[PDB]
Design a protein around this ligand. Structure first.
Ligand SMILES: Nc1ncnc2c1ncn2[C@@H]1O[C@H](COP(=O)(O)OP(=O)(O)OP(=O)(O)O)[C@@H](O)[C@H]1O
Ligand SMILES: Nc1ncnc2c1ncn2[C@@H]1O[C@H](COP(=O)(O)OP(=O)(O)OP(=O)(O)O)[C@@H](O)[C@H]1O
Ligand SMILES: [Mg+2]
Ligand SMILES: [Mg+2]
Lengths: 114, 17, 112
């Protein structure tokens, strides 16, 4: 179920939204210019702050933006609950992590971020 | 000086008939 | 196998590169020289320090430099949680098979 919240629905954050939007789009809006400087896209994003200040709201906005971008050209955004991947068997959790990352890198391409 | 409670991790086991 | 890494990429770590050369590269380059002085080659090298200080960088650099230095070498990378299986079996079988293959490649003559 694609969320229906966009960047226009978030207020009071004209800087953090700008930073995450840059880190998500700029490496893929201008691939050749990034390659000219040999600057790779960032691979680690962390969001922290007091409870109920808009972190999940920004996550939903990013998901909606990715959905719109892909529809312009659905399964690229992967949502994982915190302890969801945890399993009682000893080796199942590591195998699940590896399978998730392998599937994510399977669909990864230069023009399509995952 | 503290006490702990254990959570088990089941190991796979399979038999035929 | 990870190519395209060398000591030239790593900067600011001069003594440690020399030590890792001595412990690893030197026994392979010189064996009769070691046997003349009855000096047993060091078998195990551990790398420790603050996170992100370049342990994996030095590892891949030495892995490539061993191949480039000799005038066929095999590098094996294995992680901890990789060799864990939910079944009662294969928890130890995989490790024994890996070491048997390492011994086989050593018998072939290629350093492992
Ligand atoms: N500009 C804004 N800043 C903060 N909250 C907003 C803003 N606009 C709307 N909200 C409302 O704040 C609510 C909580 O936002 P969000 O779910 O992103 O925080 P959270 O991830 O629950 O935080 P935590 O998980 O730490 O409690 C949303 O339901 C949303 O309706
Ligand atoms: N001279 C240098 N020494 C250490 N790291 C360097 C050096 N030059 C660049 N780096 C950068 O440091 C980063 C971390 O390197 P590396 O992956 O070896 O750390 P690490 O030992 O794996 O850290 P951790 O063990 O915490 O994961 C690399 O991406 C590399 O680009
Ligand atoms: Mg939340
Ligand atoms: Mg490392």
């Amino acid at each position: 179920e694609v969320p229906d919240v966009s960047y226009a629905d978030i207020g009071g954050l004209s800087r953090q939204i700008e930073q995450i939007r840059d880190a998500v789009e700029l490496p893929f809006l201008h691939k050749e210019l990034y390659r000219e400087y040999s600057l790779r896209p960032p691979k680690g994003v962390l969001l922290y702050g007091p409870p109920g200040c808009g972190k999940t709201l920004i996550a939903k906005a990013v998901a909606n933006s990715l959905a719109k971008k892909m529809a312009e050209v659905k399964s690229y955004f992967l949502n994982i609950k915190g302890p969801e991947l945890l399993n009682k068997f000893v080796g199942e959790t590591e195998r699940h992590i590896r399978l998730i990352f392998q599937r994510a890198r399977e669909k990864a391409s230069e023009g399509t971020p995952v | 000086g503290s006490m702990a409670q254990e959570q088990t991790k089941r190991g796979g086991g399979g038999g035929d008939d």
